[PDB]
């Protein structure tokens, strides 16, 4: 699709025109942060648990940034589930609940900043274009909040007022749009199983699986927010993700080294 044709379509047709969409699909592909890794630190999985879980990970992050460029996003957790309960009981729409959840993830990002400030790692807005910190060996990492910016414009789920796109989606789409090389979800479980390990005893561990295979197993909404699976299949840059247990000391570091800890979920 020559550019003269693309520009001719961009000015004559509606953006819904299939020929314009096809012409735009042939455009070049630029990666903004090709050497960075996005990491989500779980709210209830990790941060809500206190020093026992947060301090070891702070140490891992401080040592890991010597060899790996990191964008560290935060989850929400207990306080967010309490806000959803209050608002949902009042009949408030999903867009209002979405605004309430951002406040929790922002709190958690601040608390990590208090602990990481003496190491030169800041809490920032606009992590994807935080050019200075991500180019200094003294820093080489930043912290951001995990919720997306949709706020009152949040698309409601098919049923219920709980915002369907939360911290898993917020961190993933950041990695996708800035063309990062790796996406790591840090939870409190070793990874995906056949049954819920919390509520099932005879569960079998799954080291690797595709989105299509997860849905067939009835695992579309298990260790990840299920809308992320669809975002994953439509992604241009991040075509797989990795879920690891943050309560195991060194698990994060070993994942950044290429070790196959946890579960890998592939788009195809």
């Amino acid at each position: 699709n020559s550019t003269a044709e693309l520009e001719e379509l961009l000015m004559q047709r509606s953006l819904t025109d299939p020929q314009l969409q096809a012409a735009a699909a042939a455009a070049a592909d630029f990666r903004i942060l090709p050497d960075a890794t996005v990491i989500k630190i779980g709210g209830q999985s990790v941060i809500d648990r206190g020093r026992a879980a947060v301090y070891p990970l702070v140490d891992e992050i401080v040592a890991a940034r010597k060899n790996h460029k990191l964008l560290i996003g935060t989850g929400a957790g207990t306080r967010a589930r309490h806000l959803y309960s209050i608002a949902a009981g009042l009949g408030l729409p999903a867009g209002v609940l979405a605004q309430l959840g951002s406040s929790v993830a922002d709190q958690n990002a601040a608390m990590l900043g208090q602990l990481l400030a003496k190491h030169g790692i800041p809490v920032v807005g606009g992590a994807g274009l935080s050019a200075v910190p991500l180019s200094l060996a003294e820093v080489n990492a930043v912290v951001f909040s995990g919720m997306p910016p949709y706020k009152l414009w949040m698309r409601p789920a098919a049923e219920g007022v709980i915002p369907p796109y939360r911290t898993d989606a917020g961190c993933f789409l950041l990695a996708e749009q800035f063309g990062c090389k790796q996406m790591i979800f840090v939870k409190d479980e070793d990874g995906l199983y056949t049954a819920n390990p919390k509520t099932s005893k005879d569960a079998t561990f799954i080291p690797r699986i595709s989105v299509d295979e997860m849905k067939a197993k009835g695992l579309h909404d298990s260790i990840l927010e299920f809308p992320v699976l669809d975002l994953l299949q439509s992604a241009q840059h991040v075509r797989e993700v990795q879920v690891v247990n943050g309560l195991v000391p060194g698990n994060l570091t070993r994942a950044l080294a290429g070790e196959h800890v946890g579960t890998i979920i592939t788009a195809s």
Binding site: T3, L6, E7, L10, M11, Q12, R13, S14, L15, T16, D17, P18, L20, Q21, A24, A25, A27, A28, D29, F30, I32, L90, G91, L92, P93, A94, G95, V96, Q99, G128, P148, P149, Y150, K151, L152, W153, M154, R155, P156, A157, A158, V161, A169, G170, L173, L174, E176, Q177, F178, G179, L231, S234, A235, Q236, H237
Partner: protein, 245 residues
């Protein structure tokens, strides 16, 4: 049950970006019609982007920028259209308001004055969905997301044509275009050809909570916006799928 209606007395109007691109020939009659509507409704007026957003796509795509980068760049053009329109109505007490004020303080501002203007683009920004290199959540989608979240009385889309046809009335196959007085969001979502409204609009309509119908009318004909705000059929009606209780 459904969520409550936050602002049940609100009427939302979305002005197409390519209507503004026509200049004073189209804006002045539009401004005169809106002036006369101020005493009749509590209006939130939202503006689209237009041709200037196609130019930034042309440049951005040539630079290889991702869809997450192009989304907010196009939004700026819709905001600038809102500043132009609001300026023409300043003598009547209308001004432009930012996305945070719309989301959290629309109630106070419509108590202070009769109407306000804002950008129809939603704040998806660098968290836009991947897939298409063209940002999917555009002005039509942003306006309906707000109108339905607020539980408004309706949403009216103002275009440069009479409504939705079976083909592009200004394109190569304009000879086969047939006007559609009424249609459903599901029926439209199953057709392949182009449309005058975002295809993402039909998706959010499938999950709509309150708004039952959206009418697309021609802003180049004085009086149709006024008639549509009273429920008169003067364009294309889109049934979202919501039923009463």
């Amino acid at each position: 049950k459904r969520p409550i209606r936050l602002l049940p007395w609100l009427q939302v109007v979305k002005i197409g970006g390519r209507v503004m691109d026509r200049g004073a020939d189209a804006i002045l009659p539009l401004v005169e019609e809106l002036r006369k509507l101020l005493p009749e409704h509590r209006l939130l007026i939202l503006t689209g982007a237009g041709v200037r957003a196609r130019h930034v796509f042309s440049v951005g795509l040539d630079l290889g920028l991702p869809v997450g980068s192009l989304a907010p760049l196009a939004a700026s053009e819709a905001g600038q259209n809102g500043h132009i329109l609001a300026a023409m109505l300043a003598s009547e007490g209308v001004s432009y308001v930012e996305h945070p004020t719309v989301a959290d303080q629309l109630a106070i501002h419509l108590s202070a004055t009769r109407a306000v203007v804002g950008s129809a683009f939603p704040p998806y920004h660098h968290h836009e969905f991947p897939g298409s290199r063209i940002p999917p959540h555009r002005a039509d989608t942003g306006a309906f997301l707000l109108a339905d979240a607020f539980g408004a009385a309706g949403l009216t889309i103002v275009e440069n044509v009479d409504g939705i046809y079976t083909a592009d009335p200004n394109g190569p196959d304009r000879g086969q275009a047939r006007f559609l007085p009424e249609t459903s969001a599901t029926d439209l979502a199953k057709s392949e050809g182009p449309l005058p409204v975002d295809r993402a609009l039909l998706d959010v309509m499938a999950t709509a909570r309150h708004i039952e119908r959206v009418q697309v009318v021609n802003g180049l004909v004085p009086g149709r916006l006024t008639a549509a705000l009273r429920g008169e059929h003067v364009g294309t009606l889109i049934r979202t799928g919501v039923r009463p209780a």
